[PDB]
Design an enzyme around this catalytic site. Structure first.
Site, mmCIF file in Angstrom:
data_model
loop_
_atom_site.group_PDB
_atom_site.id
_atom_site.type_symbol
_atom_site.label_atom_id
_atom_site.label_comp_id
_atom_site.label_asym_id
_atom_site.label_seq_id
_atom_site.Cartn_x
_atom_site.Cartn_y
_atom_site.Cartn_z
ATOM 1 N NE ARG A 207 45.934 56.165 3.353
ATOM 2 C CZ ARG A 207 45.244 57.105 2.704
ATOM 3 N NH1 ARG A 207 45.758 58.324 2.565
ATOM 4 N NH2 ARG A 207 44.045 56.833 2.191
ATOM 5 C CG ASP A 232 48.321 60.032 -1.235
ATOM 6 O OD1 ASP A 232 48.212 59.067 -0.447
ATOM 7 O OD2 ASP A 232 47.352 60.516 -1.848
ATOM 8 C CD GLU A 503 40.595 55.988 -4.125
ATOM 9 O OE1 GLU A 503 41.787 56.303 -3.880
ATOM 10 O OE2 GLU A 503 39.682 56.036 -3.268
ATOM 11 N NE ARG A 519 37.709 59.616 -2.893
ATOM 12 C CZ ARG A 519 38.881 59.759 -2.277
ATOM 13 N NH1 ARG A 519 39.659 58.696 -2.073
ATOM 14 N NH2 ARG A 519 39.272 60.955 -1.871
ATOM 15 N NE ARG A 581 38.923 59.372 3.300
ATOM 16 C CZ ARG A 581 39.941 59.486 2.457
ATOM 17 N NH1 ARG A 581 41.189 59.300 2.883
ATOM 18 N NH2 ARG A 581 39.716 59.815 1.189
ATOM 19 C CE1 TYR A 615 41.319 56.235 0.489
ATOM 20 C CE2 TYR A 615 42.445 54.742 -1.008
ATOM 21 C CZ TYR A 615 41.922 55.998 -0.726
ATOM 22 O OH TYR A 615 41.990 57.025 -1.652
HETATM 23 O O1 LIG Z 1 41.863 60.193 -0.653
HETATM 24 S S1 LIG Z 1 43.295 60.156 -0.149
HETATM 25 O O2 LIG Z 1 43.863 61.508 -0.153
HETATM 26 O O3 LIG Z 1 43.335 59.613 1.209
HETATM 27 C C1 LIG Z 1 44.302 59.138 -1.268
HETATM 28 C C2 LIG Z 1 44.243 59.440 -2.748
HETATM 29 N N1 LIG Z 1 45.423 59.071 -3.477
HETATM 30 C C3 LIG Z 1 45.371 59.443 -4.876
HETATM 31 C C4 LIG Z 1 46.709 59.227 -5.565
HETATM 32 C C5 LIG Z 1 46.898 58.145 -6.447
HETATM 33 C C6 LIG Z 1 48.154 57.951 -7.060
HETATM 34 C C7 LIG Z 1 49.226 58.857 -6.758
HETATM 35 C C8 LIG Z 1 49.042 59.924 -5.869
HETATM 36 CL CL1 LIG Z 1 50.353 61.018 -5.511
HETATM 37 C C9 LIG Z 1 47.789 60.122 -5.260
#
Ligand SMILES: O=S(=O)(O)CCNCc1cccc(Cl)c1
Ligand SMILES: O=S(=O)(O)[C@]1(CNC2CCCCC2)C[C@@H](O)[C@@H](O)C1
Length: 658
Positions: A207, A232, A503, A519, A581, A615
């Site tokens: 990802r 994540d 972001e 975002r 998405r 993304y």
């Molecule tokens: O919008 S999504 O859920 O597809 C992805 C968002 N990620 C945010 C983040 C950033 C750093 C560490 C962590 Cl743990 C989670």
């Protein structure tokens, strides 16, 4: 082996085609292979491409089918009421619809293998599922099969699952062909893989793609190499990179820019069922969200990513603690020793582990790699591996000793369980990467760090200034360096959001003028402007003409080098949808020289409005083509977790967009 049946140019215009007499008496034995080249750029909600059925009254649930959904999902059904068998296998986001406005020819290979009792599906050279069963059902051993059908399934004399599309080619084989044989089948893919399952990272999932065009003409990409499914952090995730020296045509075998060794790099098929899909590697340190920039002065490439100690993601990260202690305008990394309830230690200059209670240095030091030494000797810990052999996720010691790192679960000295930002550098344009260093805290001792905005940093054209966007609650926090990343300062720009995942990506509209797109939680992409080379920032505006979901998605953005309709141009990559998405677009905007406002003039559809797009990374290739590396699936949907080979790369030219 030769096909027992071969046919082509079938048009599926909501009317099935009967091929019973051509095919049914050719099927024999218990193993079969279907090879089908097909287009569907305006599919119905649910449609069957190919069917074998008992079409007789009272046997509606006796059929084999290959079906697709307008979401891009592909699958099969194998059903026999007498045997009490109803197999349903599928995977979301497996298909292409259109590319450069032209229907894509998808290449589908389905293998039904009686000897291994396994059904396997490939689409466009990608294995999307492989299912082994206790009781195997050969596709032509279904009780009372009397129809072979394209573009529907005949149930009780009526057309079910009517298709709209075309089958340019279809072949059937009375054999389960090997994986080797499958790989020799020619494809007409509109896309490439840079990172992929089985490559050098040994991550089954990826990802957070990035792309950046270096001064030498080399194009560089980074990404999350994610081992514990697509989750994540907390998980195991490394940052991997790959580069292309031929304008994106070919890519190098990946290397790691940032990696931990506390858990093995394992290629694991993560469970996709509703009971186990939220299983998460819970004791590993990880990196997440990388960003790249190139420094003109030094020539270095610089890569940052978030860092997470074992078991930590943004969810359970200690807010209200930077993980550093301030002593005289100096920040030192805190440490807690095995057995203490508080953090009695700090890492001072020369990695000397210092005891804050008695103010004496100890015999422990921390090396460059954040590994722990005692009296100069390297300490170790035992590595973990993960498996689902027991039926649930198990994390256990595997016998291998690795260097003891302060981000590790098993370490004698542990950092604060919160999120950090690390920086690494390459002196050879991505051929190797230095060991990372943590950035200092920017918002104070008792504030947790900001979150890196994945994608590209910004190297200002007319200076040595380097900028990486980060976010935290209530603001964007720009990290600014004028000395090749040796030192950094913050520029805070408040935004009208608490706890947004803001972001942000930047473009330099002209010398000193930065527009940042980000975002939000409003369903619209926002922007702000600096005329200050990043010193100060405007209030927040929103873009009309593009929709996002309430939760939003990362947007990538570049300033194109050439004029378009006589104007300077900016290109945005984002899904365009208020629902999910999906509906990937490149949006071309022409700059108004009078006020720097932007007319979003052209919307290029990457694939169908219903097909996944999340993304994304975009860069102008040296030849002035556009490269897009993107998540071709809904990376928010809880139905599309843990898919392999969905981050894909395409090459576009400006004329395709306009
Ligand atoms: O919008 S999504 O859920 O597809 C992805 C968002 N990620 C945010 C983040 C950033 C750093 C560490 C962590 Cl743990 C989670
Ligand atoms: O203008 S830069 O910021 O240095 C950059 C590259 N410009 C070249 C100019 C010549 C054609 C290819 C792109 C744009 C960013 O999106 C990064 O790809 C880096």
């Amino acid at each position: 082996i030769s096909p027992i049946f071969q046919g082509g140019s079938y048009q599926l215009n909501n009317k099935s085609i009967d091929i019973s007499s051509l095919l049914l008496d050719k099927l024999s034995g218990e193993s079969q292979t279907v090879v089908m080249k097909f287009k569907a750029d305006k599919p119905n909600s649910l449609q069957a491409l190919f069917g074998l059925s008992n079409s007789k009254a009272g046997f509606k649930n006796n059929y084999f089918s290959i079906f697709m959904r307008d979401s891009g999902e592909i699958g099969v059904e194998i059903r026999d009421a007498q045997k009490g068998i109803n197999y349903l296998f599928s995977r979301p986001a497996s298909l292409w619809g259109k590319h450069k406005g032209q229907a894509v020819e998808n290449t589908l290979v389905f293998v039904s293998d009686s000897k291994d009792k396994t059904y396997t599906m490939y689409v466009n050279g990608i294995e999307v599922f492989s299912e082994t069963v206790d009781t195997f059902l050969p596709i032509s051993n279904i009780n009372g099969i009397d129809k072979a059908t394209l573009g529907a399934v005949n149930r009780e004399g009526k057309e079910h699952y009517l298709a709209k599309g075309s089958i340019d080619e279809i072949s059937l084989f009375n054999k389960a062909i090997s994986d080797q044989e499958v790989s020799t089948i020619p494809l007409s893919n509109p896309f490439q893989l840079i990172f992929q399952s089985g490559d050098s990272t040994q991550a089954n999932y990826f990802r957070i793609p990035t792309l950046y065009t270096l001064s030498s003409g080399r194009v560089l990409s980074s990404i999350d190499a994610r081992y514990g499914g697509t989750h994540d952090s907390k998980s195991k995730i490394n940052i991997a990179t790959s580069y292309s020296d031929d304008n994106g045509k070919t890519w190098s075998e990946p290397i790691f820019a940032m990696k931990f060794n506390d858990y093995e790099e394992q290629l694991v098929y993560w469970p996709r069922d509703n009971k186990l899909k939220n299983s998460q590697i819970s004791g590993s340190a990880s990196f997440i969200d990388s960003s790249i920039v190139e420094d003109k002065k030094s020539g270095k490439t610089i890569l940052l990513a978030d860092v997470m100690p074992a078991g930590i993601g943004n969810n359970n990260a200690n807010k209200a603690d930077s993980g550093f202690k301030e002593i005289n305008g100096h920040y030192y990394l805190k440490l807690k020793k095995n057995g203490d309830n508080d953090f009695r230690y700090t890492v001072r200059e020369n990695g000397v582990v210092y005891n804050e209670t008695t103010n004496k240095p100890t015999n422990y030091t921390i090396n460059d790699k954040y590994e722990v030494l005692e009296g100069g000797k390297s300490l170790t810990v035992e590595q973990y591996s993960v498996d689902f052999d027991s039926g649930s996720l198990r994390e256990r010691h595997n016998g291998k000793q690795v260097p003891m790192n302060v981000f590790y679960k098993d370490s004698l000295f542990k950092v604060t369980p919160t999120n950090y930002i690390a920086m690494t550098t390459s002196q050879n344009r991505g051929e190797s990467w230095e060991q990372f260093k943590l950035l200092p805290p920017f918002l104070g001792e008792k504030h947790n760090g900001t979150y890196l905005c994945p994608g590209q940093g910004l190297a200002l054209k007319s200076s040595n200034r380097l900028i990486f966007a980060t976010y935290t609650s209530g603001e964007l926090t720009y990290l600014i360096s004028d000395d090749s990343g040796q030192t950094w300062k913050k520029s805070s720009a408040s935004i009208p959001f608490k706890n947004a995942t803001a972001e942000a990506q930047m473009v330099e509209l002209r010398d000193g003028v930065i527009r940042t797109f980000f975002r939000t939680t409003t369903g619209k992409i926002a922007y702000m402007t600096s005329r200050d080379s990043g010193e100060t920032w405007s209030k927040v505006s929103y873009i009309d003409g593009i929709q996002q979901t309430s939760y939003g998605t990362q947007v990538s953005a570049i300033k194109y080098s050439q004029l378009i309709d006589g104007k300077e141009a900016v290109i945005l990559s984002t899904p365009n949808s208020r629902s999910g998405r999906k509906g990937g677009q490149l949006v071309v905007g022409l700059v108004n020289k009078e006020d720097d406002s932007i007319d979003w003039k052209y919307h290029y559809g990457i694939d169908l409005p219903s097909y996944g797009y999340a993304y994304s990374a975009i860069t102008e290739l040296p030849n002035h083509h556009i490269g897009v590396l993107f998540e071709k699936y809904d990376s928010w949907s809880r139905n599309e977790l843990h898919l392999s080979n969905v981050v894909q790369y395409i090459d576009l030219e400006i004329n395709d967009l306009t």
